[PDB]
Amino acid sequence: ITELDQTAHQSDRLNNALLMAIRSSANVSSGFIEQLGGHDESAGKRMALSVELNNKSQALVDEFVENAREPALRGLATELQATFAEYAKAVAGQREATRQRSLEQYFKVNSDAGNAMGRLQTLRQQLVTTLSE
Amino acid sequence: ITELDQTAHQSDRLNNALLMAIRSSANVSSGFIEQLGGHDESAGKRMALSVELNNKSQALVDEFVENAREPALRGLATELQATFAEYAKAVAGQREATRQRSLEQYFKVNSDAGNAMGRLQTLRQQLVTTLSERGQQIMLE
Numbered sequence: 001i002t003e004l005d006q007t008a009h010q011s012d013r014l015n016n017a018l019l020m021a022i023r024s025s026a027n028v029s030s031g032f033i034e035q036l037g038g039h040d041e042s043a044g045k046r047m048a049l050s051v052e053l054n055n056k057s058q059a060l061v062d063e064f065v066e067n068a069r070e071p072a073l074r075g076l077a078t079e080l081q082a083t084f085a086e087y088a089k090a091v092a093g094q095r096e097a098t099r100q101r102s103l104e105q106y107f108k109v110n111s112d113a114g115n116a117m118g119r120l121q122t123l124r125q126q127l128v129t130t131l132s133e
Numbered sequence: 134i135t136e137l138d139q140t141a142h143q144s145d146r147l148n149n150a151l152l153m154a155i156r157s158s159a160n161v162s163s164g165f166i167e168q169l170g171g172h173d174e175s176a177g178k179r180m181a182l183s184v185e186l187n188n189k190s191q192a193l194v195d196e197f198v199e200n201a202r203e204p205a206l207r208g209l210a211t212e213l214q215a216t217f218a219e220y221a222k223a224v225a226g227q228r229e230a231t232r233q234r235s236l237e238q239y240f241k242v243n244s245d246a247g248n249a250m251g252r253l254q255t256l257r258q259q260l261v262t263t264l265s266e267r268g269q270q271i272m273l274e
C-alpha cells in the first residue's frame with residue numbers, strides 16, 4: 001500500500017515547504033528591522049537563514065510535484081509549483097531590498113509576497129482536501 | 134478508520150496553526166517596515182490580517198489540545214499551548230513595538246518570538262511523529 005503513505009508522506013513535503021517558506025520571509029523582514037536599529041551581526045544571520053530555508057522548501061516543492069503524477073493532482077501541483085516560485089521570487093526581492101537598505105524597494109515586493117502567500121494558503125487547503133482521498 | 138481520520142485531522146490543525154501563526158508575525162514585521170517607509174495604510178491592513186491570523190491559529194491550537202487526550206499526546210499538547218502562548222504574546226509585543234514606532238523594543242520581543250518559534254517547531258515535529266505513530270499503529274491493527 002504505497003497509496004496510503006506516499007500520500008501521507010506528500011503532506012510532510014507540502015507542510016514543511018510552506019512552514020519553511022513563511023519563516024524565510026519572516027526572517028528577512030525581521031532582519032531589515034534589525035539593520036535599521038544597528039543590529040547588524042544579528043541581521044546577517046537572519047539573511048543566511050532565509051536563504052537556506054528558501055533552498056530547502058524549494059527542494060521539497062520540487063519533490064512534491066515529482067510525486068503528484070496522477071491526473072487529479074497534476075495541474076493542482078503545477079499551479080502550486082508556479083505560485084511557490086512566484087512567492088520565492090518576491091522573497092528574494094525582500095532580500096535584495098534589505099541589502100540595499102531601501103524602505104521603498106521593500107514596499108514594492110512585499111505586496112507580491114503577501115499576495116502569493118495568500119494564494120498558497122488557499123492552494124494548501126485545496127491540496128490537503130484532494131490528497132485526503 | 135474513524136480514529137485514523139482524526140489523527141490526520143489533528144496533524145492538519147497543527148500544521149495550519151503554525152503556518153498562520155508565523156504569517157501573523159511576518160505581517161507585523163513587514164507592516165512595521167511599510168510604516169517606517171510612510172505606508173501607513175498598507176501597514177494598517179497588515180496589522181489587521183495579523184490579528185485575524187492569530188485568532189485563527191489560536192482556535193486551531195485550542196481545538197488540537199481538546200482532542201489530544203491520549204497520554205502519549207497530552208504531555209506534548211500542553212507544552213504546545215504553553216509555548217504557543219509565549220509566541221502569541223511576543224507577537225503582541227511586536228504589534229505594540231510597532232504602535233510605539235520603536236526599533237529597539239521590537240528587537241527585544243523579536244528575540245522572544247524567534248526563541249518561542251524554535252521551541253514550537255520542535256514540539257510540532259514530536260507531535261507529528263507521535264500522531265503518525267498512532268496512525269500507523271491503528272493500521273498495524
Ligand SMILES: O=C(O)[C@]1(O)C[C@@H](O)[C@H](O)[C@H](O)C1
Pocket residue numbers: 022023024026027028030031155158159162243246247248250251
Ligand atoms: O523564528 C522564526 O523563524 C521567525 O521567522 C524569526 C523572526 O523572523 C520572526 O519574528 C518570527 O516570529 C519567527
Ligand SMILES: O=C(O)[C@]1(O)C[C@@H](O)[C@H](O)[C@H](O)C1
Pocket residue numbers: 022025026029110113114115117118155156157159160161163164179
Ligand atoms: O501574506 C502573509 O501572510 C505575509 O505574512 C504578508 C507579508 O507580511 C510577508 O512579506 C509574507 O511573505 C507573507
